[model samples]
Target: LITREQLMKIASIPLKRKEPEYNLILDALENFNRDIEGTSVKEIYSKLSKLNELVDNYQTKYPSSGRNLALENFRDSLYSELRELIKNSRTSTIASKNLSFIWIGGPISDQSLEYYNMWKMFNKDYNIRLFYDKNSLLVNTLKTAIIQESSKVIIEQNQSNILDGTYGHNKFYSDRMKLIYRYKRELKMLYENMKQNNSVDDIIINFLSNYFKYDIGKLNNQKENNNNKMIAIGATDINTENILTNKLKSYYYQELIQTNNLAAASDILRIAILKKYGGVYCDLDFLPGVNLSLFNDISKPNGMDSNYWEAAIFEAIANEKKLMNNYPYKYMEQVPSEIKERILSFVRNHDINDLILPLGDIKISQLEILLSRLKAATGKKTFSNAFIISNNDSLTLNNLISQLENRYEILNSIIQEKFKICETYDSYINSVSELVLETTPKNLSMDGSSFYQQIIGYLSSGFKPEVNSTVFFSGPNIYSSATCDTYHFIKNTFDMLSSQNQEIFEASNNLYFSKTHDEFKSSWLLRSNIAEKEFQKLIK
Candidate 1:
């Protein structure tokens, strides 16, 4: 007689050895699936009583103590873990409407909207929101403010919040913004409620704080939280050869001459935001032909990766010790110096066994550590991805931002006012870029004549230049379309292109680029890990 424990142990046994017996048990377990549907842990346990009876009978009849005991123990452990995991699932609080997805125009485009839609089609039951401040018909400041409110709940509940993007976009002065809201429905409600309660600040702060807790718990732990979060999704910005346009970069985009680059990818620091944070942040020009998801590699695209993809990576080789450049090699060239140095230092300090770029999926403590290091490394504010998980707290989001801004001001500026930190947004970006470029060595190919040319060549080929070549992410099918105007790819475009002697876009319903459809799909699907990782790449 096989005991329940014995059955569990058998379940854990290597498939090859237990093939014959495993199938019999599987057949027996098949009946339980229907019973398990929507069942709570207690209900599941009750339903399994009959299965338990059969296993107990087998255990008593066979009387194999050692093997049976081991099997029993294994089964118990596995069941315990599974039960807890399933139990956690029943506690999901991220309602369909609460989930929001964001897209930064700097890395995602209309095509990205299509991809997002495809993901939605495959999944339903999550909400997706696109944050396109760059393209928002509203003024940039308003757009930023709206985005800020949308990204986190705390700011949305505060009437005086600057996220409303009320005013600015004046050419007379340097880009400036004065806090203002457009419709102000929620903000007004918050104000009236605060006035009536005579504890506006406290209420706002309390709400923000609670929202933080809820967000952290929901985004990091929930099954759907892995997908439907206020992600800094991959989207594109308008770019010219000499300059790239972004909401953060335009001074005319604001009027008060006080606008901050709040458009930069920094969620209000909550669980939902962090859960959606990709391991790497990405820029628009960089096209990911290979979706790292296919390889199960967590090293999603980052803004930094796009810049140095083709360059020789160099880490600290100052000691005459031979070093190897080992970050995931995307461009497929020999290792460079700067990257090698980074890897060495990273390995020396932390666990290099895991993937190099954590893709913002690190623990809070790890994030704090990384933030401290990043601040020290580049002298700027290091923001986390954990934020915007709920509508409970009102100040948590702002507090997080305040802390980040304060840290930056303390480290880099003589001015004590934390608001000054946002004023130096461009300087911060320049500083980060400078730190990245100056700290690392640009070691070229071992026998190369010029490094610049190689970089140019890589960039030249990065675009879908050839008539027949399909340069898309994820799909093995080359029939996928890359048409600039088409929102969704269908068989008609494929047929038309096939007739034209030019390869059409791949025939994929993959919603890599649709905001409306992706959001709808996100709501329909339980939640999507796929969307979360994609968002991670967009923010950086």
Candidate 2:
């Protein structure tokens, strides 16, 4: 009889063939699916279990091989189609009311209610949840439907207390006895009480009896301790009974696990958590001053009602004129050269300090004057599609992951071409770090021509102006060329568009802009007031 493992090995043998065998593999897969209905659930599960092991083995041994690439392609295609199928079902009468609030890490201080208190302001009519680990004390204080369990326990001799020997053994044994003794006494009483009714059973006594077997056994053979004497049971114990290790195993993206990049890992984890259970995920820095009941006011327009859609994305703009001009080629050519030159000229000619732009309409729809002015003034087109919040729809998480995976692939490709580094987590992160260092800007000067400038310059120099063509001017060059005061005006307006949302706005730091805690709080209050006034007007 062919064992499931044998079948997996046999199936994977075709993948090892040097020649292209896509047609042969496709036929085999088609035939396997055709006969899949005949297989029992137990048999299919057995095969899948074996195949999963084979997958891990091959993925590690032959990373980026044609076989692995094919498997990834197949995996993504199935995920995309199935994810879309799941989301389409959302149109049905039953919809998820789950809201998740997430934070990256523990609060910095006692006054950091940003993570804990925001949920209190949310409309509690729907299910609200918080996803956090033991590390985040403030998050744990919030009322949550589910609590995370730690799988790993750190075991080591308490060096300072080791000499105490309270249990008449070494400090390690003493500590173990302390932990085990507390539980043992409770279990002993329960056992004795049950013994009166002759209800003692092995199931109840088994755990009690075997509870400290490993710790006691270790103590018996224990030697003098040092820093290196520590044993991590999660990594060493057979079958790995540790809980936190098992929990972390679910996130196969090792780079996204608790790593040096805590911020990025938290961002990925929050989305992954919410994707499984729909909810809001906020950063630790966000503080809520008002109730989020306005989110449910469906009668208000798109910008007014934060919860009108199942998903929400916060939109903001950057004043990195150089960042805007990083895109190469004719990408910016969609807008007319005349408009581009006119906008660039306007920015260059104006005394940046004297350019006091109006506090244009705060509504997102009406807030396009900045972009529109660029287009109208330059006679071209402009667009931005960055999204901040998610609705936790079935497709949302998968899409988010897909984009990251795609970017990973892109970055890996770049590394392969540039540094000869294999496409692995460490290599990718190293390359990303190197890229950041290479691109890190030292000054906020907005004077030089960029790849974008040269592209626009080249396009303008070549083409004659068309009659009746409307010129719309927009881009970082035009925005950043202005004074610091005008820069903040544009930056703040970008954040104001998303003022109704729970997360507070802290623009990514640049050379020119930094703020105190008071400024962040004051700005949030001002934005919140704007949202409140708009909401009141809508009700009237």
Candidate 3:
């Protein structure tokens, strides 16, 4: 027989005081109950009684392209039933304490594991989910680590961040090649990190430097040992950083300088997923030393005023150096003139939302020349990228993303070929409002642009569109190429058309303007408040 003393000697306290084992059997049962209402069999079928009603309703609705709206908002429906479950939901009616991450392009990496460790280590109480393309190598590769960590992967039903190659094959090829190069570049960065023995410690430090506003004097000294627990409080992560600043030059040449430029759909996806599921979404590179639950624990009770939540956490970290007040400098100051000059040899100074360049890359003449070529081909407006939603009021986020959905999301086939961008842009005109259908290699000038042509035709006829020939108004997808194209289309139209005509259009209020800016009054896209502050103050 085992004695109490013997059992005590054999066992030990948990390495970490986790609420439950990772994916522990009992915990999973509770999760299953929360999702399916399995506390009783009859309750499980409580949502099923309406299937018979939906069957008849769908039979009546089935004669078209065969849409799925029978359950969407039908007279008798499944969607409403499901949503009702959400409303009446008790255990399942969760505030989405879940955390999500996305890594679409390739197999998982050491970096991925690092995030898993940190997240589970700190916020083990919350369920964490990582999303990947439904079909990819990461499907299996990632499954193992997250599973072991007691987390899970939620496969996406569809893919974005890039469109399929079938419709716009040539443009597709170029975009595809660009993706390949980004992967190869990532490999080198990863290798360099490994070579230098750069730990997650470096990530935390950079993040703290950017985010937490920690003491640079002490943190700088703490860098070598990798002991700091409290770190990283920035708006975003430093994904491109390497020891040498040459990574900047490489990023420009490869067209990856802007963080979210290539992965255009991610922010929209984040906004939407949170709206549906209700949780924190983190970019893969963005991992913090602390958990968000701390703030939530304090203010989620009064989360109605979400800013209260941010202020709560703000003051928590506000304790550290009185953030941005005594704001610490990342100075190489007074240490080595030669070293500082060499780093400055690239760009003497600096999103600082990013910590690397913190400003942008220095392509000098090459960068300017490339922009002109793109301007000639793609046009002159900047199609800025990247954003985050950490604060309490994601209700604002939901509406914005919903509008962006109204703007950017579209089907490939409906997009007007030869003038898809024009179609998309005009559609945004249709949105405030904003495609690549083959027209030409050179960007047709704004005056001659398809969108301009479409707009002019309609304007000349006094907001008459149906009579304005074959052009379909573009969707307001806010892409880089399309945004510049649309910016000039509007700019030039206002320039050339007299306010007399503009007044007539605005004054008359015809069907065309009625569809567009009337609501706007109807219209606008893009911004870049991302400019740096002076080093003497905001920067140096």
Best by TM-score: 2
lDDT tens digits, residues 426-519, model 2?
A: 3433554566456434542232212212221111110111211101111222222221112121121111121121111111111011121322
lDDT of 1 by residue, 213-232 (tens): 32433322322222233133
The best-first sequence of candidates by TM-score reads 2, 3, 1
Q: Of the pair 1 and 2, which is ahead by TM-score? A: 2
Error of 2 at 137 (Å): 10
Q: Which stretches of candidate 3 lie over 4 Å from their true place?
A: 1-95, 137-262, 289-394, 409-416, 419-540
- Stretches of candidate 1 exceeding 4 Å from the true structure: 1-97, 102-108, 131-257, 260-383, 386-388, 391-540
lDDT of 2 at 447: 29
How many steric clashes does model 3 contain? 33
The deviation in Å at residue 469 for candidate 3 is: 28
**Model 2 spans > 4 angstroms off:** 1-95, 105-108, 135-259, 287-393, 412-540
lDDT of 1 at 210: 47
> How many pairs of residues collide in each model?
100, 24, 33
The per-residue C-alpha lDDT of model 2 at residue 23 equals 37
Q: Each candidate: what lDDT?
A: 0.29, 0.29, 0.29
Mind giving the per-residue lDDT tens digits that candidate 3 earns over 424-463?
2233234222223332225554533554334323211211
Quote the lDDT for 371 in model 3.
12
